[PDB]
């Protein structure tokens, strides 16, 4: 026990082939999450033949998710036993967790993702609950995407079927509606006070992650700030640098653009969009295996393209992908020949390629400006974004 007794009696309150009451399931979940000996509880349920029963009787897929995620996360020595019971239970109920936002993850994959995610969170140090944050209410205009808002791109309503076709057909009004909101980057910054800027940064960073796997966490989901710090230690970066890169993206993002990014990626067309907090491009995340540090190879080998696009809409995965990619752009810089990057040298006279190999605490500010250019655009081809370097540099100064 001491939670299995409770759970054992609760599942006796239902038919053999029929699912328990929603409120009874909630009570099972809660018991699991609040339990001090999670492995022992699993071992117990398994002795009695009640473990598989648990997976059979709970519930609709929305609650199966909570149960599966909770068990997969809290569990350790006895994880494989929970994994094995679930497998035999899916014989009967095949659909399991694989619906809605999670339709691109087979149920066993959902389990393994929660396992890997919980392990990484404890190991990289972002398992701990984040304070409730003040999220923006905005729904239009700059800084109205998930960065500002907390609203997962994956939860946004379907773009009207007719509007989808206008998108494919390049209808100017429709394309404007679902595009980047900023043209004059400087004019946008000019209209914000130092207090406004700091407010955006705290809103961005102070919120709990918008995660597709809330119950993989021991308690509530961690602050984005915590995840950024953790990614910073992992990649020898700085939470300020990750923060500025993401703040810039998120300023030049709208709620409507979140909807197109995610929906176009999982549509028949599998568009190659940039998704989520740091606007990671789908194919780039696949190419450079940007999820390496959160998911083990077994799970990574099996992910579909559309599962990857969905993971990018999960804040913690996105933050780590973004950081991995920033560190990659910096290592790639380390190894250039500044002689062959005349325009770069020209635009960023204090650039120091060697310093890129190390922590940003010791990067010259021109290194941040240059990398900003080479994060929004192809890295180190000597073609520069004219406006992004100053845009990211402003965010960085705010942090």
């Amino acid at each position: 026990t001491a939670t299995s007794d409770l759970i054992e009696s609760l599942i006796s309150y239902s038919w053999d082939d029929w699912q328990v009451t929603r409120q009874e399931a909630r009570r099972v979940i809660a018991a699991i999450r609040n339990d001090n000996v999670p492995d022992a509880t699993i071992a117990a349920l398994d002795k009695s033949g009640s473990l598989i029963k648990l997976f059979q009787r709970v519930g609709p897929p929305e609650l199966a998710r909570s149960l599966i995620a909770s068990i997969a996360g809290r569990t350790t020595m006895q994880r494989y036993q929970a994994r094995n019971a679930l497998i035999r239970s899916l014989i009967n109920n095949p659909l399991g967790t694989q619906t809605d936002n999670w339709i691109y993850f087979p149920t066993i994959t959902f389990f393994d993702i929660c396992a890997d995610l919980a392990d990484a969170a404890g190991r990289l140090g972002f398992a701990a609950a984040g304070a409730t944050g003040v999220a923006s209410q905005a729904i239009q205009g700059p800084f109205s995407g998930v960065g500002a808002t907390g609203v997962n791109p994956t939860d946004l309503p379907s773009i009207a079927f007719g509007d989808q076709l206008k998108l494919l057909n390049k209808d100017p009004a429709t394309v404007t509606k679902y595009s980047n909101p900023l043209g004059d980057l400087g004019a946008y910054l000019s209209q914000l006070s130092p207090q406004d800027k700091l407010n955006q940064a705290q809103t961005l960073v102070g919120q709990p992650i918008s995660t597709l796997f809330p119950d993989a966490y021991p308690g509530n989901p961690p602050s984005r700030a915590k995840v950024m710090s953790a990614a910073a230690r992992k990649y020898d970066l700085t939470p300020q640098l990750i923060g500025a890169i993401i703040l810039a993206e998120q300023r030049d993002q709208t709620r409507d653009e979140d909807a197109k990014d995610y929906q176009a990626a999982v549509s028949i067309k599998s568009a190659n969009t940039s998704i989520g907090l740091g606007q990671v491009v789908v194919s780039t995340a696949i190419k450079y295996e940007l999820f390496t540090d959160l998911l083990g190879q077994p799970v990574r080998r099996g992910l579909s393209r559309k599962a990857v696009a969905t993971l990018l809409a999960s804040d913690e995965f996105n933050i780590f992908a973004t950081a991995r990619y920033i560190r990659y752009v910096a290592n790639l810089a380390s190894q250039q020949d500044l002689r062959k990057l005349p325009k770069t040298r020209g635009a960023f006279p204090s650039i120091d390629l060697r310093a890129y190999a190390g922590n940003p605490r010791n990067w010259p500010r021109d290194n941040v400006r240059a990398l900003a250019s080479e994060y929004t655009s192809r890295p180190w081809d000597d073609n520069l974004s004219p406006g992004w370097p100053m845009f990211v540099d402003d965010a960085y100064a705010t942090f």
Partner: protein, 124 residues
């Protein structure tokens, strides 16, 4: 699509410079960089090239003539993949060639400006 003042190159190339673009005399024509400090600016190059274009190129009609082009895509960044148009038009004995690049998150761009710039380019 919109142009203003016309530019003439010592090598007998005549074209209009697109509005909102800064222009630069190039070795064999002109380079146009979109003005302002944009995140994702369009870059455009128009040139006289005395040597012909390769075969194997899927063509399209450019007004009262035929154009041969190829579009290439590279990894870019946040703003999307890099798209590069290469398009050539027969002009007298030689050819006029246009080069354009642009990032896109939403698939291959139309390159409308670049096509306009090519079609209305002078062999004299």
């Amino acid at each position: 699509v919109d142009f203003d003042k016309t530019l003439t190159h010592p090598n007998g190339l005549v074209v209009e410079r697109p509005v909102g673009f800064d222009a630069r005399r190039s070795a064999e024509g002109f380079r146009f960089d979109e003005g302002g400090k944009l995140r994702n600016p369009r870059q455009l190059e128009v040139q006289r090239q005395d040597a012909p274009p390769p075969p194997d190129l899927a063509s399209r009609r450019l007004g009262d003539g035929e154009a041969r082009y190829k579009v290439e895509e590279d990894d870019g960044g946040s703003a999307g993949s890099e798209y590069r148009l290469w398009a050539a038009k027969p002009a007298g004995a030689r050819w006029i060639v246009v080069s354009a690049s642009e990032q896109s998150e939403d698939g291959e761009p139309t390159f409308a400006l670049a096509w306009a710039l090519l079609e209305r380019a002078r062999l004299q």
